[PDB]
Amino acid sequence: PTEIENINPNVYDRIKERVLTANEEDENVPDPFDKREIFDLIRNINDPEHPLTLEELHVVQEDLIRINDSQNSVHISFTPTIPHCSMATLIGLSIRVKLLRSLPPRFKVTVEITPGTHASELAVNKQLADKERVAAALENNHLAEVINQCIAAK
Amino acid sequence: PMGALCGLVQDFVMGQQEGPADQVAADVKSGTVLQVVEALGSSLENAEPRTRARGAQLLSQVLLQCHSLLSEKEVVHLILFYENRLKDHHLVVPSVLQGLRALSMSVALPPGLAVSVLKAIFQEVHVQSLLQVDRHTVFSIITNFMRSREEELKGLGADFTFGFIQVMDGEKDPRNLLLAFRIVHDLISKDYSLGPFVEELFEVTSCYFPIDFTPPPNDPYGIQREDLILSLRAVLASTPRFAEFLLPLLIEKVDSEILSAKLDSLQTLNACCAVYGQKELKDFLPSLWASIRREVFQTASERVEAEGLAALHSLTACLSCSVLRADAEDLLGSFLSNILQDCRHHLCEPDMKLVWPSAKLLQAAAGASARACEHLTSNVLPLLLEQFHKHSQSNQRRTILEMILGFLKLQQKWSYEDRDERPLSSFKDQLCSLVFMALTDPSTQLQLVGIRTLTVLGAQPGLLSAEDLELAVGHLYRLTFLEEDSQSCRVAALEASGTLATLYPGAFSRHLLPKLAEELHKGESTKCSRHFRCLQALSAVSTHPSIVKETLPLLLQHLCQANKGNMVTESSEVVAVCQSLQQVAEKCQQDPESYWYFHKTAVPCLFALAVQASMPLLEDEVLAALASVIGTATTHLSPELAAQSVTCIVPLFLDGNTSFLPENSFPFQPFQDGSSGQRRLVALLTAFVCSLPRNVEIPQLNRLMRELLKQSCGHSCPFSSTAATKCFAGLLNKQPPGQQLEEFLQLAVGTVEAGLASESSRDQAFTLLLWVTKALVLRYHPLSACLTTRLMGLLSDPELGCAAADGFSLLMSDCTDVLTRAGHADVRIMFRQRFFTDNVPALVQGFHAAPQDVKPNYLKGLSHVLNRLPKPVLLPELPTLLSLLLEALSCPDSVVQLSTLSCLQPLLLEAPQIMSLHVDTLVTKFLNLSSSYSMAVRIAALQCMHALTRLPTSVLLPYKSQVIRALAKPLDDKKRLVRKEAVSARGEWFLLGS
Amino acid sequence: GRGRLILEHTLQGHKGRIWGVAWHPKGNVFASCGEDKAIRIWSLTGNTWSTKTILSDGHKRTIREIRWSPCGQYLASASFDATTAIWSKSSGEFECNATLEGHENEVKSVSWSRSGGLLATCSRDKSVWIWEVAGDDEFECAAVLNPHTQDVKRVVWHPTKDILASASYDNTIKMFAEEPIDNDWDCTATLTSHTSTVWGIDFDADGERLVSCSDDTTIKIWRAYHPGNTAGVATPDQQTVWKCVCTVSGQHSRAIYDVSWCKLTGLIATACGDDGIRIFKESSDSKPDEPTFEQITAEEGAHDQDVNSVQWNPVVAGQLISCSDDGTIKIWKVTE
């Protein structure tokens, strides 16, 4: 819960970017995969219905991403806009397609709805975890076209 | 013959018109007019209207070709006949008016006849009922008489303009509309007598106004919209006789919600203000500004905004000129205050969205006349100052100041008198407090705006309090010292430091130079960024000659205090001192005395160097930056001062004379001894002698170059020998084509080939060859033809082959130290084209006819050329050359790999049809290189794999499958950036097909 | 483990992911399907495996599974284009003679009965179709069943009898038997122990047991209990009931997409999403009511991506084949 006499307009202000890690990577030393790199892969994915990114709508957040480079595991928790949003599966699917194209095949990606943030979270998580149904969905030309529109970088 | 003439008639009437049209004209050209009009009279006397109309049209077609060559006794008769036939005939009139147009183009007619010619046509024929083409003929008859006989048409009085008023009442065609506008404009331009018809004349023109259109059947033929809108501006703005009529129309138009209209009305208003004045707009002057202000707030079109602000400008300008005209009373300066009072409450309003456009308006009216702004600023400033102190928020204070800033600039723009300074003095001390407030605020933006105002108040001719200068300088030092801020605030303060320094140099010698002198020895006895601040601070203030006379000894003293203590070890910080000196010399080249003083301390600079050789400290490379500093001193030099310093420097190297330099160095032969120290010092000569004006007038060029050649290769030093070649070539390039230059070349090719003969020092001879061929290449001197094709042979030599590649690479790039466009070294821009053309046959032929072992040396050279010429010329030779550029990627050298990749990347996006023919070998080479040891190489290779997507889908599709599989490996690359590039590349490769 | 799994061959014929592989009943030929919409028939000549025929244009979308008829004559392919193609070598070359349509969505699985006259398909439309084969090239639908509430993943016929088993996205397995008086198909029993999608199923040699692998990272052994059974298990209905008598857990990191039970050795192989192939053998002293299965050998890095299918060889004991999303087909030889 949050107070009514106290409201913090600063959240509008809180969105920022910092992509300066080059010095550490300048040498020949390997650079582990981290939360920041995955977040940079999904923060600018466009919402299917609105002219804003998943980051601007707080659908994806850096601290909702868990990753272990050595154990080849990536977990993404995304909060769809409103609990009865019928686009939750589409949004998570665009996240999957982006990570599927951008991540090494050794990485096992899990994309789930943030717990308690959607009425049908169990059913959506089950669809996104079924690799056969995800593949069959990508063979839908209209669906793949909308996904490509969300994944496009501009 | 009359039989032939009668026949031509009948043939025309029967429909064989074209032959007779020209054949009757031919009979006219040779033969008579009266015979043909009598033959045609019979055919025209026939009862059928088409039998009259056809005859008349073939009469006019004749009269049009005959033109001038017509008797006065014929012109009268013809015009009379035409009048009678037009009076009697219906739908025959078009043929008649074409003949009247023909008759209006002759000049041998009586005065009364000419006047009646048109008077009768507009009293008889109704223009609106007539066809578009025929209306064009009627209008052109007018314009004809409006050219041939003005005195008659003017003598007709105002009833001519009235008659024309009715002919042009209703006319929709654009083609004639421009004609009608011309007639109106000429009725105004020439002093044609307009009677009570001023109203009537404006009435017809006024109605048409904004609508713009294009015609579907004839689009380019149909003269476009802006053509018509401009012709109307011309007529509606030609007279102030239209004022009491046009201004109410334009206001009517501006207040209408159609945007195209809103525009044309202000564009016209601006054109009117060029020929209006005080009285014509006086009655409607209050209403007009309400409309201008209106649209400056409301409108979203910035071109509307701009034109309306231009309107308020030209308006107040028109009112400021008439303050001198009206000797009795001025009702013009009252309008300015009527604006002020109407937006005072709007500015005072705490809302910041409303405040900016009204300030834009006040600035537009102020920047119209010095008289206007001296009223406006003096009235506006106290309100802006009051509102500055009322608002405690930062962004508000920044905007308020940015608004004040404009007014201040405008004050400096026109007024130069002591009059505008008098009310400004009342606000002077109040303004400074705002400037210093903007500098103290933690805002970066507010600071920058304060700096912007500081320079503007500094620019001011009007006197300012001395204390403020003391304060301001202190503030500037605080802003140049603090680094917790973003770099921008620092640079802004440094630039302003120089700007104000040229105005008031005492202020910076009083409150900045001592502070920095103290800070110098406070770090002399984390450390580098502290040094940067003050060194650059002394560099940036070095704008006034007095300051230069102070900052130079301080920097040289810091340089001669660096060798005594522990500062020589840090070669980086010594380089920084030189960098600042080079920047001061760079500033001194403006004022002649300034660079004269700097050059007389270029001497102690070389002294501090000679001493370094006399002892047995500075790092070998630090010297090069010192030499670049010396070079910046030498250029821009008085020819007499140049001779003076040459006769001090050249003596020192050549004979060891150190007379000019101070005694401490005396405790010396660089040329014939063999001592390493003195040989190192040659590179300062490279900077000097080779950075002199074209008219060098050197005293002993022959001996110096003679010594240089032996020094260049005989010593065989790692870098000292090269400095000699660098210098020799630097001076050789600059040398004019005198009978000496060829001797210098004889000695150059001599020592070169001689060193190439001896086993012991091939590289020394090679470097000299390189620099000599370069100097002659940038000159396009014929001997470079041989020497470059000498370096062509050396590509096959095992010892020097890699050195031959290095040489080609050097020839391909401009270098800072030797020969520069601003270093007074002669160069022509087109050398890459000239060099490339010669190179391709030699290198391509050499590559194919080269043995397996020393075959890739030729490609290394070709690449160092091709990639360094990213030019148009690379495209037309690409079909032959790309085959090699692809095999250039397979070279093991990382520099070659990088250069060839960097060059190939845009080619894919500029000329893809030529590239798409080599896709298989393109993708194979790129994917091979996206897995090399070098990080940068992999990044480039991936960017080219990402660029390959730009080619047509058709050629890419058979590769998508294999490509994606391969691109999986770089996704798991050790470095972060190579993963970023793989992300982009693969992502694009996935969207290839749908 | 005491046992070892040895890689014999690696084949990279397809472009993209490879979904299914299937042994010819003679064990000297196998087929493979994948994302490339093509079927490849692989024959063994000497010591080298090679593609003898390539089948294209048979399906417009991805081919999920292919299954050989008990006769070496015909091949069936289930694809995402809602069709099931039947291939036959009537012209001396394999051609598509018949096409089975009817499913509304993508067809996930095919299977042939032991006799070879019954063919079963299942799709994402939650349905299971059963077809009859009158003569060559002709097929007649016997029944359309909609018992499953979700996507049906696999269909497998009984080795000894004409019983059909189906695994579904609804976490359940369903048995199908034909009713004696009317000769109409109906659902026999429902097996509910998995907590997530059941991907694969396979019968024991005799057919009284069944493996099932699931998305819950576990495999389960099901035992058929007839009415009047010796155990204390009672059947309220006349039909036989199946019971989860064993659950192997903690052995797999991710979803298990396929499982194969060899009819020659009794070994069980699993194809997991952690790129690992695991071999299980029943213990010597395992009880028929609480069997214990132990992992004798495994190759955790069997593929570079998810292992989609594993199939034992019906003729050669201990020879396993597998395919994966890395685009590779691997033939293995296990030695206990």
Side-chain angles (χ1 to χ4, degrees), chain A, chain B residues 1-324 326-994, chain C:
Chain A
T2 306
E3 266 274 25
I4 185 174
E5 302 88 340
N6 300 324
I7 173 173
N8 172 264
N10 262 26
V11 174
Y12 168 55
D13 298 288
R14 271 159 202 197
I15 300 176
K16 296 172 188 164
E17 287 169 358
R18 285 104 164 199
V19 80
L20 298 234
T21 85
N23 350 32
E24 295 59 27
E25 298 61 14
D26 267 308
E27 296 88 347
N28 197 28
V29 183
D31 295 333
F33 284 82
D34 59 22
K35 304 162 58 185
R36 178 64 179 274
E37 185 174 354
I38 301 297
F39 187 59
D40 286 338
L41 289 169
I42 65 175
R43 61 194 305 174
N44 290 326
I45 299 181
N46 297 116
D47 182 273
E49 302 172 300
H50 304 275
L52 300 88
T53 67
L54 300 185
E55 177 187 11
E56 296 170 335
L57 298 172
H58 299 99
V59 178
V60 298
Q61 303 172 17
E62 186 174 348
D63 282 18
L64 289 176
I65 299 176
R66 306 177 71 185
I67 181 180
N68 191 290
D69 189 5
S70 181
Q71 300 189 40
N72 300 331
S73 303
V74 178
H75 182 97
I76 312 284
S77 177
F78 70 102
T79 302
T81 57
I82 291 168
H84 305 272
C85 180
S86 58
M87 306 286 167
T89 308
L90 179 58
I91 292 181
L93 193 57
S94 64
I95 298 176
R96 291 191 56 88
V97 178
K98 175 68 183 189
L99 295 181
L100 179 61
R101 299 175 179 178
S102 312
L103 293 184
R106 71 185 196 296
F107 273 109
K108 309 281 187 169
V109 183
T110 302
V111 181
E112 295 178 332
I113 288 180
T114 302
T117 66
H118 195 272
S120 302
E121 52 170 303
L122 295 179
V124 173
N125 292 2
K126 198 182 179 179
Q127 283 190 124
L128 300 177
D130 190 303
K131 73 171 182 177
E132 181 190 59
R133 302 190 67 177
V134 168
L138 299 183
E139 296 185 347
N140 186 329
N141 291 338
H142 290 203
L143 181 56
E145 176 182 352
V146 171
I147 288 182
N148 285 333
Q149 270 181 23
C150 306
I151 302 311
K154 275 164 192 184
Chain B
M2 281 306 305
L5 292 165
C6 300
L8 292 176
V9 165
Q10 303 308 315
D11 288 347
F12 183 93
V13 172
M14 290 178 293
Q16 297 298 297
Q17 292 198 334
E18 299 177 354
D22 291 303
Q23 288 299 308
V24 174
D27 284 347
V28 172
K29 291 173 191 177
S30 294
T32 37
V33 198
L34 276 144
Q35 290 181 303
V36 290
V37 299
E38 290 199 302
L40 305 140
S42 303
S43 71
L44 296 176
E45 271 172 63
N46 293 305
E48 279 181 296
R50 286 190 205 171
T51 312
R52 301 144 168 171
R54 273 181 280 175
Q57 209 157 79
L58 175 65
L59 301 173
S60 303
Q61 272 169 280
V62 168
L63 288 179
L64 220 87
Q65 268 279 87
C66 313
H67 231 292
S68 60
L69 283 132
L70 247 143
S71 173
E72 181 173 277
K73 265 198 187 181
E74 294 176 318
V75 164
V76 289
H77 272 116
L78 276 159
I79 269 145
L80 257 110
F81 169 86
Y82 269 87
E83 286 168 327
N84 171 62
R85 288 275 79 88
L86 147 147
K87 197 142 192 167
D88 298 328
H89 286 324
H90 175 71
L91 304 161
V92 183
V93 281
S95 324
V96 181
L97 285 147
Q98 288 160 7
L100 263 338
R101 186 193 61 212
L103 273 157
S104 79
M105 291 194 83
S106 52
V107 170
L109 28 163
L113 198 84
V115 156
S116 158
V117 166
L118 57 162
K119 211 198 182 202
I121 132 253
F122 47 59
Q123 222 243 52
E124 250 48 66
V125 277
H126 190 113
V127 170
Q128 289 80 276
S129 63
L130 289 216
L131 281 140
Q132 185 174 357
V133 170
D134 294 314
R135 288 136 127 205
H136 190 90
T137 80
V138 177
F139 271 120
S140 55
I141 306 159
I142 304 148
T143 2
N144 284 327
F145 283 111
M146 284 254 298
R147 168 207 186 172
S148 66
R149 274 99 186 274
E150 271 130 11
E151 262 184 62
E152 271 142 55
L153 297 190
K154 275 186 171 185
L156 242 164
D159 287 276
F160 165 62
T161 115
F162 175 52
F164 170 71
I165 279 150
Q166 292 163 267
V167 288
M168 192 212 89
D169 171 11
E171 201 45 37
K172 292 180 180 179
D173 103 287
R175 184 185 48 163
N176 321 339
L177 268 164
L178 304 144
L179 251 183
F181 294 161
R182 189 201 301 274
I183 297 157
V184 153
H185 187 78
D186 301 347
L187 281 177
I188 282 145
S189 297
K190 307 203 78 250
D191 204 299
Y192 270 92
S193 12
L194 320 238
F197 313 114
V198 192
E199 296 235 27
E200 257 119 317
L201 197 279
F202 180 83
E203 199 157 69
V204 172
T205 43
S206 320
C207 69
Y208 290 23
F209 202 43
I211 271 206
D212 43 29
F213 72 127
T214 318
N218 267 290
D219 289 80
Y221 162 79
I223 281 161
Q224 259 88 309
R225 306 176 289 168
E226 199 73 331
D227 292 331
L228 282 162
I229 298 179
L230 257 134
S231 61
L232 254 171
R233 287 199 198 157
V235 305
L236 301 164
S238 51
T239 5
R241 285 244 258 168
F242 282 172
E244 44 176 84
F245 311 99
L246 219 231
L247 304 179
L249 252 224
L250 305 182
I251 305 166
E252 220 174 294
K253 304 288 178 146
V254 142
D255 303 347
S256 81
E257 273 190 26
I258 325 109
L259 258 137
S260 35
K262 280 193 194 177
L263 237 165
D264 291 335
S265 40
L266 287 149
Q267 292 183 276
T268 56
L269 179 76
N270 266 86
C272 287
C273 288
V275 272
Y276 280 10
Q278 169 172 6
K279 55 276 121 236
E280 358 65 273
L281 38 67
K282 176 276 263 278
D283 281 17
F284 316 141
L285 187 169
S287 325
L288 290 149
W289 169 75
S291 14
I292 273 132
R293 170 199 58 87
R294 208 205 316 313
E295 305 310 318
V296 166
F297 293 110
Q298 287 187 306
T299 211
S301 170
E302 26 79 82
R303 34 189 64 251
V304 170
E305 276 185 346
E307 206 81 63
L309 285 150
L312 182 60
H313 164 83
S314 40
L315 250 131
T316 47
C318 233
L319 303 149
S320 61
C321 296
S322 293
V323 184
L324 314 129
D327 296 273
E329 265 168 38
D330 145 273
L331 294 112
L332 322 128
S334 45
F335 154 72
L336 294 145
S337 38
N338 259 332
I339 296 154
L340 275 146
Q341 274 197 338
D342 284 36
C343 37
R344 175 157 68 111
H345 334 292
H346 211 116
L347 288 144
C348 284
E349 229 97 284
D351 304 282
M352 309 307 280
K353 267 183 175 177
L354 298 158
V355 81
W356 204 270
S358 85
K360 275 173 169 152
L361 277 158
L362 296 148
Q363 285 167 350
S369 94
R371 260 187 182 149
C373 92
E374 69 187 59
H375 177 37
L376 280 156
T377 59
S378 62
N379 233 281
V380 155
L381 282 151
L383 291 147
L384 264 165
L385 281 138
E386 261 176 41
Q387 217 183 332
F388 183 96
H389 303 298
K390 254 191 176 180
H391 291 132
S392 294
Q393 293 163 65
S394 70
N395 270 88
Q396 296 189 304
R397 284 179 174 161
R398 177 196 66 112
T399 48
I400 288 161
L401 215 146
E402 263 277 79
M403 285 179 261
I404 306 156
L405 215 350
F407 284 101
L408 290 155
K409 285 176 177 177
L410 295 165
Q411 265 271 347
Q412 313 263 260
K413 280 184 190 158
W414 334 127
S415 194
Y416 52 96
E417 298 123 58
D418 325 329
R419 280 195 175 182
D420 288 50
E421 293 173 29
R422 287 177 186 208
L424 249 162
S425 72
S426 320
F427 314 133
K428 232 144 251 163
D429 311 85
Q430 275 190 70
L431 280 220
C432 301
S433 56
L434 310 195
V435 184
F436 304 136
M437 259 296 281
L439 310 157
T440 50
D441 214 88
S443 310
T444 63
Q445 273 191 296
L446 245 158
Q447 256 169 251
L448 297 148
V449 176
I451 292 155
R452 280 194 211 127
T453 354
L454 214 194
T455 35
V456 165
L457 310 216
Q460 292 187 327
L463 184 146
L464 246 177
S465 179
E467 294 177 349
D468 336 336
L469 345 155
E470 283 196 355
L471 252 160
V473 182
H475 281 272
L476 282 148
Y477 173 66
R478 184 204 61 194
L479 304 176
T480 53
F481 186 79
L482 132 136
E483 80 160 346
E484 275 196 323
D485 210 314
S486 195
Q487 302 95 340
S488 47
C489 295
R490 312 181 214 179
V491 188
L494 288 145
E495 198 178 296
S497 296
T499 308
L500 297 146
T502 36
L503 282 139
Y504 294 95
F508 290 89
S509 190
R510 276 189 183 93
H511 275 258
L512 179 67
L513 296 185
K515 288 181 185 170
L516 295 165
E518 210 184 75
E519 198 66 78
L520 268 161
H521 323 299
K522 226 72 77 184
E524 202 191 81
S525 56
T526 51
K527 298 166 187 183
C528 296
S529 52
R530 280 176 173 177
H531 220 235
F532 277 127
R533 287 164 240 169
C534 37
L535 263 290
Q536 294 170 297
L538 293 147
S539 182
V541 46
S542 332
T543 55
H544 193 94
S546 74
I547 294 151
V548 159
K549 285 167 172 187
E550 255 178 282
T551 40
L552 246 178
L554 275 150
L555 285 168
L556 287 136
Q557 272 172 266
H558 181 86
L559 249 181
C560 297
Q561 267 176 319
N563 46 260
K564 298 170 176 173
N566 312 323
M567 298 269 277
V568 253
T569 50
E570 194 72 21
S571 71
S572 180
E573 266 180 51
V574 185
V575 150
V577 186
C578 301
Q579 277 252 275
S580 84
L581 285 147
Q582 181 258 299
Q583 259 121 53
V584 175
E586 207 190 277
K587 280 160 182 167
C588 295
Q589 47 202 46
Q590 204 159 68
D591 185 82
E593 296 163 282
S594 296
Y595 78 78
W596 177 55
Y597 175 79
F598 203 110
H599 216 267
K600 288 219 183 186
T601 60
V603 180
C605 165
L606 278 162
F607 175 45
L609 282 135
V611 179
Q612 286 147 347
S614 192
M615 168 64 92
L617 0 249
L618 67 77
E619 175 59 352
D620 61 58
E621 106 76 67
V622 92
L623 305 167
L626 227 355
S628 86
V629 164
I630 286 159
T632 42
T634 21
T635 344
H636 329 265
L637 232 71
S638 173
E640 61 163 275
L641 206 272
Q644 276 169 59
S645 85
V646 175
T647 55
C648 305
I649 292 166
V650 155
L652 171 56
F653 277 66
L654 210 151
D655 293 333
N657 168 297
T658 65
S659 57
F660 68 130
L661 280 178
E663 65 325 314
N664 281 339
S665 68
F666 304 1
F668 174 79
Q669 296 177 335
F671 286 110
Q672 297 254 333
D673 283 346
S675 325
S676 181
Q678 5 208 310
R679 285 173 171 255
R680 237 208 195 173
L681 298 163
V682 163
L684 295 183
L685 218 48
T686 63
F688 181 76
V689 220
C690 310
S691 314
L692 279 164
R694 293 188 185 262
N695 323 349
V696 272
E697 292 182 359
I698 306 177
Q700 283 162 239
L701 169 89
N702 222 316
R703 305 183 196 181
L704 215 151
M705 301 272 263
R706 292 180 183 172
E707 197 288 340
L708 295 173
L709 294 174
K710 294 178 180 179
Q711 153 92 180
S712 80
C713 51
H715 180 309
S716 78
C717 211
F719 98 80
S720 337
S721 67
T722 54
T725 97
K726 267 186 180 265
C727 187
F728 173 78
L731 278 149
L732 170 88
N733 166 84
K734 282 218 280 176
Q735 191 146 65
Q739 293 189 304
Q740 242 198 165
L741 179 121
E742 287 83 36
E743 181 197 1
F744 289 80
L745 300 160
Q746 271 171 42
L747 300 154
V749 199
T751 59
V752 162
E753 279 316 315
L756 293 167
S758 181
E759 68 282 5
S760 26
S761 333
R762 289 293 212 59
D763 14 18
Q764 281 83 38
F766 177 78
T767 60
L768 171 66
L769 175 55
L770 275 189
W771 294 85
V772 160
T773 66
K774 183 162 201 194
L776 299 169
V777 141
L778 312 133
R779 211 175 186 286
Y780 341 131
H781 178 276
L783 172 65
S784 62
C786 337
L787 312 191
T788 54
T789 59
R790 179 81 186 88
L791 292 157
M792 280 297 311
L794 294 170
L795 286 153
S796 63
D797 183 72
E799 289 192 336
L800 306 142
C802 261
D806 294 341
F808 250 130
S809 217
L810 172 64
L811 299 178
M812 249 6 279
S813 264
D814 25 31
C815 18
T816 44
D817 38 326
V818 211
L819 39 251
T820 124
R821 324 82 199 251
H824 278 176
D826 122 279
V827 103
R828 292 177 188 177
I829 272 202
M830 267 4 176
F831 73 129
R832 338 256 204 181
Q833 257 183 359
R834 254 249 220 162
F835 186 50
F836 163 92
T837 61
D838 146 286
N839 181 89
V840 174
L843 271 181
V844 170
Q845 284 196 311
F847 148 79
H848 291 100
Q852 302 168 68
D853 50 313
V854 218
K855 214 227 272 175
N857 299 61
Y858 283 91
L859 294 119
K860 261 182 105 294
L862 240 172
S863 59
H864 280 306
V865 177
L866 291 175
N867 313 139
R868 297 270 244 263
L869 328 177
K871 295 183 86 181
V873 292
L874 199 65
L875 208 152
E877 281 284 290
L878 241 238
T880 47
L881 271 302
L882 217 258
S883 186
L884 314 151
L885 260 153
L886 285 146
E887 280 161 51
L889 299 135
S890 73
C891 167
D893 191 17
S894 52
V895 205
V896 166
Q897 283 168 342
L898 255 145
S899 202
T900 191
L901 271 166
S902 64
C903 188
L904 278 156
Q905 196 192 276
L907 289 163
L908 302 139
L909 333 154
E910 340 284 60
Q913 287 62 36
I914 314 159
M915 302 293 282
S916 56
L917 299 149
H918 298 89
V919 178
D920 188 70
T921 191
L922 267 170
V923 176
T924 304
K925 286 273 133 233
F926 290 149
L927 287 172
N928 275 343
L929 282 162
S930 55
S931 60
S932 78
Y933 195 81
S934 176
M935 195 213 302
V937 168
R938 285 188 265 105
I939 285 145
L942 278 158
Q943 287 166 321
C944 295
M945 277 302 291
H946 171 263
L948 253 145
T949 71
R950 199 136 296 198
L951 319 177
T953 313
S954 46
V955 299
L956 296 249
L957 283 150
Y959 301 91
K960 193 185 174 189
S961 315
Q962 50 156 114
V963 167
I964 284 161
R965 272 191 101 172
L967 285 178
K969 186 175 182 162
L971 289 168
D972 203 48
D973 202 294
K974 52 182 177 188
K975 284 106 170 195
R976 245 165 114 151
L977 289 154
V978 45
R979 279 172 276 166
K980 187 191 169 202
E981 302 310 316
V983 154
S984 181
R986 212 201 200 193
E988 288 297 292
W989 269 89
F990 266 92
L991 296 177
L992 297 176
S994 286
Chain C
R2 295 179 180 176
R4 295 180 181 177
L5 182 65
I6 302 305
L7 173 60
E8 292 193 326
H9 298 290
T10 301
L11 305 182
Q12 201 175 348
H14 293 278
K15 293 180 180 179
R17 69 202 310 175
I18 305 177
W19 282 105
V21 289
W23 285 113
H24 191 269
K26 292 296 178 301
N28 61 335
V29 170
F30 74 91
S32 63
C33 57
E35 180 184 6
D36 55 7
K37 304 138 184 182
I39 305 178
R40 300 175 89 88
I41 311 296
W42 303 77
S43 63
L44 173 60
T45 313
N47 207 351
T48 169
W49 286 89
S50 50
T51 299
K52 82 173 185 182
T53 53
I54 295 182
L55 312 186
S56 299
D57 197 24
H59 292 290
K60 299 180 176 181
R61 299 177 75 191
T62 299
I63 311 167
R64 179 63 182 84
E65 194 183 26
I66 48 191
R67 277 308 177 204
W68 290 103
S69 55
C71 69
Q73 289 179 336
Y74 302 141
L75 185 69
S77 63
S79 169
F80 284 178
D81 55 359
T83 62
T84 302
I86 310 299
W87 308 80
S88 45
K89 180 177 288 166
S90 175
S91 321
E93 293 174 351
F94 270 108
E95 190 183 345
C96 175
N97 290 153
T99 296
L100 303 191
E101 301 181 334
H103 277 305
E104 302 164 14
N105 304 103
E106 312 87 26
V107 188
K108 297 306 177 69
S109 182
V110 244
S111 188
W112 300 86
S113 60
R114 171 182 65 97
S115 68
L118 298 186
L119 180 145
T121 60
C122 62
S123 169
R124 199 244 302 172
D125 53 22
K126 316 166 183 64
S127 68
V128 172
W129 288 39
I130 299 185
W131 297 75
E132 277 175 4
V133 194
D136 195 345
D137 300 334
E138 294 305 326
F139 294 89
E140 208 162 9
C141 178
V144 171
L145 312 182
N146 300 274
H148 275 302
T149 61
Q150 296 293 341
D151 176 25
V152 194
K153 295 302 192 181
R154 202 76 48 82
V155 279
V156 173
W157 283 98
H158 194 260
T160 303
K161 321 172 189 180
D162 286 14
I163 310 292
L164 183 59
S166 64
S168 176
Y169 183 93
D170 56 41
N171 314 1
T172 65
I173 316 173
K174 288 184 176 299
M175 296 292 180
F176 300 103
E178 186 174 5
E179 151 217 24
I181 181 66
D182 287 274
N183 298 335
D184 279 41
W185 287 101
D186 201 280
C187 183
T188 287
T190 297
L191 301 74
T192 318
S193 187
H194 276 303
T195 75
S196 192
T197 293
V198 187
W199 280 104
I201 41 182
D202 199 13
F203 284 99
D204 197 336
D206 52 65
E208 301 293 310
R209 294 185 300 177
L210 179 75
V211 243
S212 64
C213 63
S214 171
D215 185 82
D216 53 24
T217 73
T218 67
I219 58 175
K220 293 176 179 289
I221 307 288
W222 303 90
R223 184 112 215 178
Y225 283 162
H226 297 256
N229 56 82
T230 310
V233 186
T235 80
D237 303 349
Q238 317 89 341
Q239 311 290 338
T240 46
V241 298
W242 298 75
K243 280 285 182 177
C244 179
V245 297
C246 179
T247 300
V248 191
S249 311
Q251 290 307 324
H252 303 77
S253 304
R254 299 195 173 273
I256 321 175
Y257 296 105
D258 197 16
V259 57
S260 185
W261 204 346
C262 186
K263 64 178 181 179
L264 312 180
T265 65
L267 296 181
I268 294 178
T270 65
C272 184
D274 58 22
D275 319 350
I277 297 179
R278 298 171 181 81
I279 309 297
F280 294 87
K281 184 177 179 58
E282 195 177 0
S283 185
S284 60
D285 61 326
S286 62
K287 295 172 177 298
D289 297 3
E290 284 191 6
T292 49
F293 290 77
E294 296 178 347
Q295 173 182 327
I296 56 183
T297 181
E299 205 71 14
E300 294 188 355
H303 291 271
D304 301 332
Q305 298 187 39
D306 302 24
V307 195
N308 289 326
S309 181
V310 286
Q311 291 298 137
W312 293 105
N313 194 285
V315 179
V316 191
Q319 189 170 71
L320 183 70
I321 195 183
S322 63
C323 57
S324 170
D325 288 332
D326 59 10
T328 65
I329 306 167
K330 295 189 176 183
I331 298 177
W332 310 81
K333 180 181 182 179
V334 57
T335 303
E336 309 181 18

